[PDB]
């Protein structure tokens, strides 16, 4: 009923708008009521709130021009820097496609700055890569020295400045003043200062605060932050040890186990990533990350029925996407559940909300067509994958294969060149171009293409045979 | 595969393509004759049996069903 | 040998197919007829709107955007894919939002496309939006005389990241 | 009645003649909740800009 | 009898696909297609006062009729990006005769249809106007010795001293006869009230006054005694005259065979086993199948 | 049906209503003594509705009284001095009212009536936000209630008598309030993320027994006491789930990756553990023994309050209530329905219509293989040129642009005509001159 009471109830219920508006009203009506002020702050900052553990974002500057790793040639297995590319598709040369996109996945690192600007903006990130990673209250006006004396206002105002205004400098100033006031004996302000430092790029001054907070109160968030720091310094084994210490404190925490699995899967050790994802399953059994990762892995290691079980589980728990339904249609067609494939593909096409998702669904429908044995429907599906996303190297490769099957060698050559220019990390257009070049002579381009094939997927046997043939011809 | 899918006219036309295409394998003729017999036809089943015997080749099971359809026609 | 292991799911599903294979077969044939219908539909629509960057008159075009600032190098890779015949009369037009983007030369002619060679044709797009606002940019390759685009390409221009 | 007799030998390759490789079917990765919310927020900003 | 708001029927006769007397058509759209049935059959969707009717527009034999007192979840899916226009879809989720049905209606023409908004608006009006067409006990009908009127309602008469021949202590009440319902509320404990709408009344007579209600939604025998028999018969006359004048055109207050198997919301399941108590979880859980267990169903 | 909240007696509860936590209650308010439960629901309008579901129908609603002012909290307990019978306490912003739901029968099941008789009322000189109740101290056969004003003040009423009121120290917004009996302590979650436990005697005498800096602020706090083996204070933070010991430290904690709305630790099944029940803003219920997820099921609505009660000869029925009005009893669905396309025979493929369309489209396909005049006039005199462009249909998104040469320059380069109606004429005029 009353203004403040109803604003509180709205905020509790995650309205975040009715309480904000009613707070504007109650503030204009009575210029002296700080409860409504901090409540409007909370509503504002929680409309936009995002988990800081998951906000790991890396720009080109932080990839190339920010050096913080101690070693330079660490032993293989002690730094972050399965199905072969002949089975599991790849996003870059290494790091085949995953089952779960978090906003911190890397899937490689661009070498130079030229290598990074001249590459599709979502090749090493889960969002377009950057160069670096009226109003409510005016930040310059309010004096943090006054708010930091009272923590009830201090914590909410800090959350507002750090998560809404995104001004890490004023946030760190308020956090420093507030930690001064509280005589350095509350873990929360330590963790907030650590987050501010980690944003500013000072990973050791942030590790210091996370460590000083763990000594005060062992909480899941501090372990996740500290492992995030230890991974920013490129020390995966320190992070694994910290995670295991956390799991010693919290005997079954799913976030720690999933962090361990993410590390083991970024070190490209799927044998332990899958074991820790299986532990997460033994704990959660609705975990989207664990189920998607084990499901993809099962699909690609000659077990589409088990992957179908896992994705059907994701569908039972109320997930309704374009990716989920594409995956379901694929696992159905390959598990030989021919009665549930094409309806899942149509549902996926319905749910698609991009032009890359539509292109991927038409690409997979073209694969279903190729399997069914009709190259005309396959032709149309690959061409529609191109219509929906012109930079779809796989559609070009498969369409060129079908063309070369028809007899159109020049069409196939141009399409394979476009593909191998769009995705240089893909061995298939390189190998195809080299093969149909050697078939017609032109051993120069045949060799130039076999070399890039072997650069993309080196243990490929046919590429080795072709390279040896061409090197014999050269001598 | 179509005969066991409750779809026998497509089985007919598929067998028609098969017998027009195949020259030196009587198993196609034997299977078409068995389809015709089990369809109660039994008149062109002898035509299929004759096409088969014009092509003779003995699998261990290709003989028994052959001679059983034979004594039946 | 690394012959895979088949769990109970495989045997249960081959059992359900052994009992009820005819329903699966009929429903798959129905869904495949519907799929051919929808694919022919979408393909006819793309032919109608000239949305395909690959479709006599043998040509191919894709576009690349390079740059992260308020200025992007939009390079069009255009290729004549034929045994031996050049393509004389071609032009490229850009359809863009004249508020968000500033292209100096929208319309320009295309050189004699020697068969088998990739021609990269550069342009400089400039994000004019003072905020971060992206938009699509279409590229029509078409003969001079005719008025129906021989083909089209689409480019989702990335965010400005400028000022 | 008579069951349909079937061939038993099957078809075997005698040589590995080179062929053309197709790319492989792609399982689309599932987006996290935080990634979904970031995309939602940026799309909503673009939208509330477009309406003017 | 009225069934177009209470049931979800398939392959309806062209006489029942037509506007029931009290019904009014609200909106329509052509080229709507039926998904959750993968026949690819184009059709035509129609939103009426009481239900949504889809029919094939080429073979109108195959069609669907979904009532508003059966729909639980009506959602709109705006998707299908630039490849064509935004082919908006509609998702209806219903529970009829204890079975969950799901219908997907895809507007093939790429434009966004205004029908999907009128649908939800009229459904909201339907749900919010159930005091017109349903039986209610002990509800909130009286503000202060005075009835609370519906949107389309006029109170015709108000009789006093009306006893209730269903209790023994809280009896002396008041009787409001209206153009949409007859209500009785006690003098003391004004929370003891009954409201019977003419749609539910089947027969009014004297036996000392007896209302017999429709057995299709609960057959109650409500008896009220009035002191002067003259006023008794007068009220009987008024009530029956109002019932007949209402029956010719019902108000409804809305302000503004094996094919059904294909429309299962659950999927290959149409009945829930009996809910028992699970000692493992400590909650009520539906009876487990023979072989299955809770920890064997929870694991992946 | 697997992993769905299978429905039971359910009903929507008004016309654009508004409910919160503390509205939904579930107890034997009628004092039947049998053991069933009756669903009580207050509203932010005044509609105190009490139901006894019998699976909807019309016998379910015991009563639907409408009080003038909104109903913030509803509770059921021994709120009257002498009798040991459960009563119904209703809390509005500035009023506390304890009723007595007495039902008297009629000869027929639809002739029995129920009345709520006001057993007493207290005026509140402050605007309340919520309240809790218990045996303050060690008094037996009593449930005296503490009401938290929205400006941080615990006003304790021993039934029928305003006992006292103490200002909570250092609080701006109001938080969730709970009462522990194993420690005789009020427990709050203040605005500075501090879970604070005060002793009741220290409050009555007036400070803080203990504190714990959890990382956020709490929606609900449930001190569950069905088990006496070890008391534990459960806390639902706005991001994390906590179970705390009686001394103050964390017994365990889980980091939810979702936004919780309501939680309820119901009875436990194993030895030492406690089954708990948390609802998402993704309208999904999670059953967690300790921190291990034992089950998860999709709710119809985002619950604002969940309870688990025995309703009409069935134990452990889940009773959810939203803020729209969706009130629903439910059980958990444990049928792993087969994944198979339906074997319908009526629904077949209309091959004729579909084949006409397919032949049409295939015709366009096999055919693909085998209206605006622009005129420029240059004046004979920086010479001024004028371009006249005309149509014959209703063209749209028209753009005209002029390209002369590098040295030559134009004063106007682009002209945008959004729509021009049919057989109409547009005329632009620019001027070209040498620059260089």
Author numbering:
A (entry chain 8): 1 to 81, 90 to 141, 158 to 499
B (entry chain 4): 347 to 402, 408 to 424
C (entry chain 1): 425 to 479, 483 to 590
D (entry chain 0): 7 to 58
E (entry chain 5): 6 to 212, 219 to 267, 296 to 339
F (entry chain 9): 2 to 56, 63 to 213, 234 to 397, 410 to 420, 439 to 493
The authors write:
Thus, the BBSome is a key regulator of the composition of transmembrane proteins in the ciliary membrane, and is thought to be evolutionarily related to other transmembrane protein trafficking complexes including clathrin coats and the COPI and COPII coatomers. The recruitment of the BBSome to ciliary membranes (where it binds transmembrane protein substrates) is mediated by a highly specific interaction with ARL6 (also known as BBS3). Here, we use single-particle cryo-EM to determine structures of the native bovine BBSome complex with and without ARL6 at 3.5 Å and 3.1 Å resolution, respectively. The structures reveal the mechanism of ARL6-mediated activation and provide new insights into the pathogenesis of BBS-causing mutations and the evolutionary relationship between the BBSome and other transmembrane protein trafficking complexes.
In the absence of ARL6, the eight subunits of the BBSome are arranged in two lobes that we call the head and the body (referred to as the top and base lobes by Chou and colleagues [Chou et al., 2019]). The head is formed by an asymmetric heterodimer of BBS2 and BBS7, with the other six subunits forming the body. The head and body are connected by a helical neck formed from two abutting coiled coils, one from BBS2 and the other from BBS9. BBS1βprop occupies a special position in the BBSome, cradled loosely between BBS7 in the head and BBS4 in the body. Relative to the body, the head is more flexible and less well resolved, while BBS1βprop shows additional flexibility independent of the head movement. Within the body, BBS9 interacts with all other subunits of the BBSome. A crystal structure has shown that ARL6:GTP interacts with blades 1 and 7 of the BBS1βprop. However, this binding site is occluded in the BBSome structure, as blade 7 of BBS1 forms a continuous eight-stranded β-sheet with the corresponding blade of the adjacent BBS2βprop. BBS2βprop is unique among the BBSome β-propeller domains, as contains two Dx[D/N]xDG-like calcium-binding loops; the first in blade 4 and the second in blade 6. A calcium cation can be seen bound to both loops, coordinated by a network of acidic sidechains and the mainchain of the conserved glycine.
